[PDB]
Design an enzyme around this catalytic site. Structure first.
Site, PDB file in Angstrom:
ATOM      1  N   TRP A 130       1.339  -1.159   0.015  1.00 12.96           N
ATOM      2  CA  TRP A 130       0.107   0.241  -0.097  1.00 12.96           C
ATOM      3  C   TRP A 130       0.900   0.945   0.118  1.00 12.96           C
ATOM      4  O   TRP A 130       1.673   1.493   1.064  1.00 12.96           O
ATOM      5  CB  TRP A 130      -0.814   0.205   0.943  1.00 12.96           C
ATOM      6  CG  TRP A 130      -1.586   1.187   1.612  1.00 12.96           C
ATOM      7  CD1 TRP A 130      -2.338   1.667   0.680  1.00 12.96           C
ATOM      8  CD2 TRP A 130      -1.345   1.977   2.593  1.00 12.96           C
ATOM      9  NE1 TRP A 130      -2.290   3.211   1.013  1.00 12.96           N
ATOM     10  CE2 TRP A 130      -1.900   3.332   2.571  1.00 12.96           C
ATOM     11  CE3 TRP A 130      -0.718   1.655   3.901  1.00 12.96           C
ATOM     12  CZ2 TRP A 130      -1.729   4.129   3.749  1.00 12.96           C
ATOM     13  CZ3 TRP A 130      -0.878   2.618   5.132  1.00 12.96           C
ATOM     14  CH2 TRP A 130      -1.047   3.775   4.290  1.00 12.96           C
ATOM     15  N   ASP A 211      -0.407  -3.511   9.826  1.00 17.73           N
ATOM     16  CA  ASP A 211      -1.525  -2.300   9.752  1.00 17.73           C
ATOM     17  C   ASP A 211      -2.394  -3.236   8.849  1.00 17.73           C
ATOM     18  O   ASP A 211      -2.616  -4.308   8.543  1.00 17.73           O
ATOM     19  CB  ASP A 211      -1.033  -1.806   8.577  1.00 17.73           C
ATOM     20  CG  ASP A 211      -1.894  -0.867   8.064  1.00 17.73           C
ATOM     21  OD1 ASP A 211      -3.477  -0.298   8.806  1.00 17.73           O
ATOM     22  OD2 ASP A 211      -2.150  -0.823   6.529  1.00 17.73           O
ATOM     23  N   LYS A 246     -12.425   1.765   8.028  1.00 15.54           N
ATOM     24  CA  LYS A 246     -12.928   0.457   7.095  1.00 15.54           C
ATOM     25  C   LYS A 246     -14.739  -0.260   7.455  1.00 15.54           C
ATOM     26  O   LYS A 246     -15.135   0.151   6.654  1.00 15.54           O
ATOM     27  CB  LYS A 246     -12.095  -0.049   5.862  1.00 15.54           C
ATOM     28  CG  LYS A 246     -10.730   0.716   7.162  1.00 15.54           C
ATOM     29  CD  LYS A 246     -10.334   0.573   5.031  1.00 15.54           C
ATOM     30  CE  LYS A 246      -9.620   2.508   5.778  1.00 15.54           C
ATOM     31  NZ  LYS A 246      -8.173   1.749   4.394  1.00 15.54           N
TER      32      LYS A 246
END
EC number: 2.6.1.1
Lengths: 396, 396
Positions: A130, A211, A246
Site C-alpha cells: 500500500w 497494519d 473501513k
C-alpha cells in the site's frame, strides 16, 4: 526560498477516480475506490454510527481536550478486539494503546517514535505494498525495503520468494505485517503459513509492526484478527497500527490505534512513554468524535450487535461481487480462469489487466481501474456487473 | 531494542493541575488550565456548537473521507477571518489554506514541509515561549532560537531587547509571530510597535509564520487579527497556523488551518502542493467534525451571530477576572502594584510569583499556578477570587 523551485507531483488518489465526471459519460462505476460502497454505490453513515451520535450530542457536555492517548475504553476494547478476550496480553498489561487519527495516522506515529528510543533505520515492506507506506516512512528518517509478496502468473502468494528476499537484512530490522488481507493484492498468508514465519521472526530478531485496516471483511473479524494472534503470544515486542475507517465507515472523523505491546508493564510503560511523547509534537492529543463513537457501540450490548452485523453484510456484499464477477465470465467471458478472486480476502483483488488494458478502458468504455489491474470489488454492483463484464471480454 | 534503555520524562500538563484531586482539599481552583472555564468553572459545549451539531447528524449522509486539505469553505471563511474581507490576498489567491487537526497540528505541518522544499534550518522563537514549540519543531529537523520577548521588572514587553537578539541570525531564518496575545505572558506588540517590525522583516529576508490561537479574547477578534494584517499586505510569503479550539470551545475534535500565503497563485499552488504532500505522510486527510462545525456557524447568518457573541462573553469574563483580581488587592492586598494584568490580552498573565511562592502555595493553601508565575485568569472566579487573594497576600 519557499517560493519557487518547488516540485509539485502529488498522491495519485487520482491515478484514477477523480475526473470520472470526465467527458460526459454513461460509465457504470469508478472501481478501485478504497472506501466501501453499496448497491446504489453509496458511502453511508451506517446507523450504528448515527445511533451512537445521538448519544454524544445530548450526553456530551464538554468538547474539552481529550488526552494525548485519546480515550482508555477505546483502547480496552480496541485491545480485546485485536487479539484479547480475557486473554493475558491484556492482563499482563504487556499491551499499551494509543488513540490515533487513523491507522494511517498511527503508522508514522510508529516511525518517528521508533526512529529515536529505538535502533531502527529500516522498514521491510511487501510488494505490491500500500504505497502510502513508502512515503509516510521516510517522513522521519527510515527506509522501506520491499520483499517478495505476490508472484503473479497463478495470481497468488509466493512463500517460496517472500521467505527469501524478506528474510535477508539485519536483526534490528522491522517489517509491518498486513492483517488478514492486502492492498493492492487481496492476498494473504494462511495461519499455517503465517504461524510458520512467526517462529521465524522469533528466531531472527526482526520485531513486528502490523497494519490492521480491515477486520471481518473477507475472512471473518476474529479468525481474521488471529493472523496476528499467531504472533501475539509469540514475540515480546511488536506493534499494531489499526483503523476503524473501513469497518466503521468512519473515514472522515479519524480513528485508529497505536498499540505497542512491549514485554512487561514497566517496559510497555516507557517504550511507550516515548510513544506518548510523539503525539504531542505534531497534533498534541487526538480528536474525540469517531473515537468516541467506536467505544460507545462496543459498550452498548445492543449497538455493536447491530454494528457487527452492519459489518457482516458490507462483506457478504464484497464476497458477493467476486463470485458474481466470475459467473459473469464463465457465464459470459469463457476465456481465462477468472477464478482466483473469490478466494482472496477483502474488497481488493489485483486483476490481471496488464496496464494498457486498464487504459483502452478509460475511453469509449469510460471505465476506471487503477493501473496495476487494481479494482474495487466494493464498487462492483449487480446493475454494474454486466456492463463491466462486457468491457473486460472486449479488452480480452 | 525498543524495550529497555528508554527514557520517559513527559510533557508537564502536569507541572500543575492533574493530581489536584490531591490530598483531599477545600482548594478553590486549579488556575493555569489553558482551556476556558465559566463561573461554575466549567468547560462547555457552547450552544452554537450543539446547534451546528444537530445539523450534521441529520444532514450528514457520509462519513466518507474528507480531502487532504480538509474542506474548502472552512478555508474561504478561515481566510476571511484571518485578514480577509473582500480583501485581495483572498482575491489575488496569493493565499492557499489547509484543514488541520489543531493549529498545534498545523505547526509541525509547517515544519516538515518547510524542512524540505524550503531552505530552513532555524526557527526564531520568543521567550517566554509556548514550550510545545521547541518540541514540535525538532520533530523534523530544525532548531528554535529564543529571542528577547518579556523583560520582567515592569512586567511588560521589551522592544529594546526583542529588536536586538531576534534581529540577529540569517536571511532564510524564520520566526513565528504570536497573534494578539501570548503564552505564557499575556503580552503583546502594539500595531505601532508591530507595524514597525513588519517593515523590518521586509527588510531582513526573514519570512514569517504566526500562531493564531486566540481571536477576540482580550483585544477584539478583528483588530486582534490585524496584528498580522500589519504584515499580510506587506510580505510576499508567510504562513498562519491557526486554531478554533479556544474561540470555538472545540478542543477535542481537532481543528485549525495551515495557510501558506505565497506571492501569486501558481506559486501558492506549488509551495503548497508540497504543503499538500505533508498531510498524507502522517494523517492523510483531516478529521471532519469540529471542522464541519466551524464552517457551518460562519455560514448561518443566525448561528455565528450567536457564536461571535458566545465568544464576546468568554472574554468579558476574562477581562473581568483581571480588574477583579486587582481590586481584590488594592481593595484587599495593598502591597505592590498588582496592576499590569488587565492591560494584557488573553486569559494568561505571567504573575510575578517567583517560584517557591507558587510552591508554598500547593500545600496548606492547596493552590495551583504553573511554576513560572503562570496563571489562568479563565479559572479565576468571583467565588474563587477572595480565597485566592488571601493566599497571595499571605505568600506576599
Amino acid at each position: 526560498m519557499f517560493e519557487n523551485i518547488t516540485a509539485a507531483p502529488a498522491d495519485p488518489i487520482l491515478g484514477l477516480a477523480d475526473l470520472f465526471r470526465a467527458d460526459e459519460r454513461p460509465g457504470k462505476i469508478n472501481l478501485g475506490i478504497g472506501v466501501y460502497k453499496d448497491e446504489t454505490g453509496k458511502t453511508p453513515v451506517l446507523t450504528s454510527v448515527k445511533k451512537a451520535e445521538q448519544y454524544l450530542l445530548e450526553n456530551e457536555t464538554t468538547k474539552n481536550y481529550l488526552g494525548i492517548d485519546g480515550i482508555p475504553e477505546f483502547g480496552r476494547c480496541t485491545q480485546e478486539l485485536l487479539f484479547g478476550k480475557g486473554s493475558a496480553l491484556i492482563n499482563d498489561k504487556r499491551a499499551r494503546t494509543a488513540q490515533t487519527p487513523g491507522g494511517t495516522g498511527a503508522l508514522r506515529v510508529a516511525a518517528d517514535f521508533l526512529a529515536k528510543n529505538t535502533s531502527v533505520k529500516r522498514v521491510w515492506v511487501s510488494n505490491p505494498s500500500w504505497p502510502n507506506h513508502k512515503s509516510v516512512f521516510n517522513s522521519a528518517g527510515l527506509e522501506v525495503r520491499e520483499y517478495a509478496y505476490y508472484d503473479a502468473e497463478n495470481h497468488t502468494l509466493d512463500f517460496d520468494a517472500l521467505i527469501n528476499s524478506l528474510n535477508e537484512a539485519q536483526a534490528g530490522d522491522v517489517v509491518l505485517f498486513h492483517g488478514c488481507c492486502h492492498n493492492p493484492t487481496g492476498i494473504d498468508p494462511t495461519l499455517e503459513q503465517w504461524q510458520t514465519l512467526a517462529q521465524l521472526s522469533v528466531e531472527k530478531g526482526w520485531l513486528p509492526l502490523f497494519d490492521f485496516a480491515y477486520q471481518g471483511f473477507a475472512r471473518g473479524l476474529e479468525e481474521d484478527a488471529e493472523g496476528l494472534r499467531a504472533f501475539a503470544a509469540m514475540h515480546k515486542e511488536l506493534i499494531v497500527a489499526s483503523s476503524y475507517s473501513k469497518n466503521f465507515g468512519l473515514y472522515n472523523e479519524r480513528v485508529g490505534a497505536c498499540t505497542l505491546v512491549a514485554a512487561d508493564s514497566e517496559t510497555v510503560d516507557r517504550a511507550f512513554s516515548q510513544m506518548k511523547a510523539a503525539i504531542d509534537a505534531n497534533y498534541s492529543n487526538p480528536p474525540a468524535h469517531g473515537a468516541s463513537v467506536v467505544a460507545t457501540i462496543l459498550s452498548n450490548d445492543a449497538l455493536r450487535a447491530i454494528w457487527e452485523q452492519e459489518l457482516t453484510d458490507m462483506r457478504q456484499r464484497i464476497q458477493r461481487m467476486r463470485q458474481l464477477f466470475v459467473n459473469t465470465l464463465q457465464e459470459k467471458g469463457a476465456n481465462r480462469d477468472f477464478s482466483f478472486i473469490i478466494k482472496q480476502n477483502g474488497m481488493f483483488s489485483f486483476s490481471g489487466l496488464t496496464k494498457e488494458q486498464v487504459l483502452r478502458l478509460r475511453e469509449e468504455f469510460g471505465v476506471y481501474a487503477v493501473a496495476s489491474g487494481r479494482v474495487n470489488v466494493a464498487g462492483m454492483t449487480p446493475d454494474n456487473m454486466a456492463p463491466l463484464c462486457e468491457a473486460i471480454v472486449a479488452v480480452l
